[PDB]
Design a protein around this ligand. Sequence first.
Ligand code: HEM
Ligand code: HEM
Ligand SMILES: Cc1cc(N)nc(COC[C@H]2C[C@H](OCc3cc(C)cc(N)n3)CN2)c1
Ligand SMILES: Cc1cc(N)nc(COC[C@H]2C[C@H](OCc3cc(C)cc(N)n3)CN2)c1
Ligand SMILES: C[C@H](O)[C@H](O)[C@H]1CNc2nc(N)[nH]c(=O)c2N1
Ligand SMILES: C[C@H](O)[C@H](O)[C@H]1CNc2nc(N)[nH]c(=O)c2N1
Ligand SMILES: [Zn+2]
Lengths: 405, 403
Amino acid sequence: GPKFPRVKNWELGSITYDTLCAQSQQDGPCTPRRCLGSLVLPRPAEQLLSQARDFINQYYSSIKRSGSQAHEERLQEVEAEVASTGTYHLRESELVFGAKQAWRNAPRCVGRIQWGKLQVFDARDCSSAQEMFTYICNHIKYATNRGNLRSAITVFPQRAPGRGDFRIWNSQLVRYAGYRQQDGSVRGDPANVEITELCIQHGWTPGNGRFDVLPLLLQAPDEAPELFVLPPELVLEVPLEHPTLEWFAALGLRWYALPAVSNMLLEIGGLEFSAAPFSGWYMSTEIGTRNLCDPHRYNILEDVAVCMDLDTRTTSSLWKDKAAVEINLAVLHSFQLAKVTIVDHHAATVSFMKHLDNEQKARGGCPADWAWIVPPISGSLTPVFHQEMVNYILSPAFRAQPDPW
Amino acid sequence: KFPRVKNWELGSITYDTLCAQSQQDGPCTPRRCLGSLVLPRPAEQLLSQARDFINQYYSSIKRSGSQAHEERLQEVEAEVASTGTYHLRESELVFGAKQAWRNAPRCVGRIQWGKLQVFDARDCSSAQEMFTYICNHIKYATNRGNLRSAITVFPQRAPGRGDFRIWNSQLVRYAGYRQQDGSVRGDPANVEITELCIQHGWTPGNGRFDVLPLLLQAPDEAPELFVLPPELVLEVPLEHPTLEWFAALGLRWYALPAVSNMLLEIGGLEFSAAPFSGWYMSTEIGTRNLCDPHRYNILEDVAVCMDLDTRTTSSLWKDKAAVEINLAVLHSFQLAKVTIVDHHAATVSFMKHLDNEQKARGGCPADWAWIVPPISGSLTPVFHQEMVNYILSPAFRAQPDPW
Ligand code: HEM
Ligand code: HEM
Ligand SMILES: Cc1cc(N)nc(COC[C@H]2C[C@H](OCc3cc(C)cc(N)n3)CN2)c1
Ligand SMILES: Cc1cc(N)nc(COC[C@H]2C[C@H](OCc3cc(C)cc(N)n3)CN2)c1
Ligand SMILES: C[C@H](O)[C@H](O)[C@H]1CNc2nc(N)[nH]c(=O)c2N1
Ligand SMILES: C[C@H](O)[C@H](O)[C@H]1CNc2nc(N)[nH]c(=O)c2N1
Ligand SMILES: [Zn+2]
């Protein structure tokens, strides 16, 4: 048949061919000799212009004015700007399209059915660390919306020739402190040990809890990062209880409402937005499975299993599986009681299948990273497990970038 | 470039250098990864695969460069030059089969790769004889519940003629009967092979767990039908340690997972019929075979029996029922003294395998999507372990169905 990858769903027996992958401009890490799909992060005058031309072409196609006079004029105007300055600038509506397209292009995101519904805050006028804070607080207030969460991104000024970057040092806008103890263990979230210690080196007075919300370390160009404490009333958290296990509330577990990634680079048309935090709402497994049960995170499985009186001395009791399921259930139940938006892993994966069909019809495929899209409990119980996926890099894109220190 | 391979739970890092030994391309390119696809789409080359394989063998027995090694290379050269093909000595076959298992990227059970009973059935000239060898394989491997890994190797592919083939995908398979009203009674995965048995003379049953006969095919002949003696096929009724109603569901599964439709390639030679078996990991039965929607699909029935709220996904009724079903399988196999490994023990053993292999060969090819179990992924260590996938030979391969 077609010379595009054939893609099969083994639950349903249905077949598609991905033609979209033909548009990839950027090589991933695989070769015919070996596949590196399971690695988390495997290792410009005329180069900018070709990325910019491509992006402008994407824009004009999206508004159905390809080949138009307005399209040709924008193209000239971009090359003139690069010509005289080395860079160029997006129109507002271009930025909005490019931000959404970056989300839509993100292979690791199961929540892409929502991609067209993204509030884009333009913060390209921002000129200080103090102003970044205001923009960030506004983002948090808008996005949180007292529990009825709204997807959003806030875009700060782009990288510029020989000027320092805007950066948010924290990986997320909300992070619990991780305090290294004398014995070598950690109180709080071990994922955050390094940022915690950077906050302390930069003048923060540390708490001693398991859920101390961290301050933000915000860096305006060519300045030391400045420290900003989020007013507590802005940071919506959800205490965790279980619907029938009454003792679960006594564990004092909690999580925050708003998942807002702040350390990734938004690339659009070769332009690099080094600070562009974005937020959605949580899939319940992120909290109840990874953040709470990973051995290298809060690691609470054994404690919960012991409370549930399970036999923790043997694997074949499936004590881990039982406790994990109850932890996820408590996450879902508590978020529901508190009226804070959340999506379980069944509803989310079902919606992603719908997204796949939509994208097949709209673009001829959808880049997806199977290992990231399949949830970390109950995998084959979700429809995405049975769905082959093709993974490739399209731009606009969100990318990892090196830590600023 | 040698990939840096990180474990994200422990922060430990290795470099896979074994991948340089791959002489066989997989489906990925720098423009797109196809690692999630289940099956993506001359004398001088036989000689090079043959020399390489003989070189692997003499090196395995340390005698790399000896008289015996050099003479054996010439035998292989002489035979290919004269006939376009060659034959393996039994010791070479035994080594090659083990190595194919070892190299199988999708197998989580490879800590066991060195314990493999290898039956040479290359002196087989008929479907009848294949059946005798298969019965002996089942008897050995089953061993009254104390299961033992095994492979039986029937005669290789030859340019002149049809292949020896076992038509069935496994040696034990439950019938799947389609109903004019669309539904399937039994195992929907075996509708086709069920229908093929009927068409070749089998009197069907009408249960949910009717064990199929084998269709065995000798070269250029119609396949023949052979009913396995019920006494040879060990099965485990499923009950649950606390939920009494669960036994009333009538569920069971067989003890012996024996794959019979894959080709075994050693030194360029191809073995189209080479059934191989180990023991089950509980999630293969409890999660996939019983809970897949296109398999026995029993999740709902179990949830109702547990009185769960089936109206909404957010009660996690599915997750809760799947767990009890896996528990029942583990409990039932244990009660019956039939070998089984749960998915926590299995993946822990695989992590140990990765480490042994790192020391021994500088790597291990592994397919993360297959290694990570279908429930409780991130609760197992392998979820957090990066993996490099690539094709080494000797290898097991998929091959076209013979009809
Ligand atoms: C609206 C609800 C949303 C849900 C339920 C959702 C769900 C998810 C989940 C479960 C992941 C994997 C996270 C992990 O394991 O750490 C993820 C990754 C991601 N999503 Fe979303 N998403 C949502 C909205 C968004 C939005 C608004 C953006 C960007 C504008 C976005 C971009 C991403 C990116 C870039 C990743 C990859 C992160 C990385 O590589 O570390 N998603 N999404
Ligand atoms: C001794 C205990 C064994 C265990 C627990 C085990 C476990 C597994 C599991 C869980 C899978 C994934 C199966 C699936 O999802 O359908 C698998 C695949 C496989 N194993 Fe094993 N294995 C064992 C022995 C063997 C032996 C003896 C061989 C060969 C001699 C072997 C070769 C394979 C191959 C080739 C596959 C891939 C099959 C395919 O592509 O569909 N394994 N193993
Ligand atoms: C927007 C959004 C919604 C939602 N429900 N969940 C998220 C979670 O994304 C969090 C992001 C930050 C960590 O990144 C780890 C990481 C490390 C490295 C080296 C690369 C990479 N891409 N990702 C895990 N995923 C984000
Ligand atoms: C030896 C062994 C031990 C154990 N515990 N489990 C097994 C399970 O193997 C069953 C085998 C047959 C199915 O084949 C599906 C399949 C289809 C296709 C087109 C290709 C392919 N490689 N695999 C999946 N795995 C085998
Ligand atoms: C090694 C492996 O790639 C790594 O643990 C991945 C697997 N899948 C994942 N999937 C999601 N959604 N998030 C993750 O952090 C990971 N971790
Ligand atoms: C599409 C996807 O690759 C397919 O569902 C795979 C996923 N992982 C698997 N893993 C195992 N062990 N066995 C399988 O059959 C599958 N199926
Ligand atoms: Zn790949």
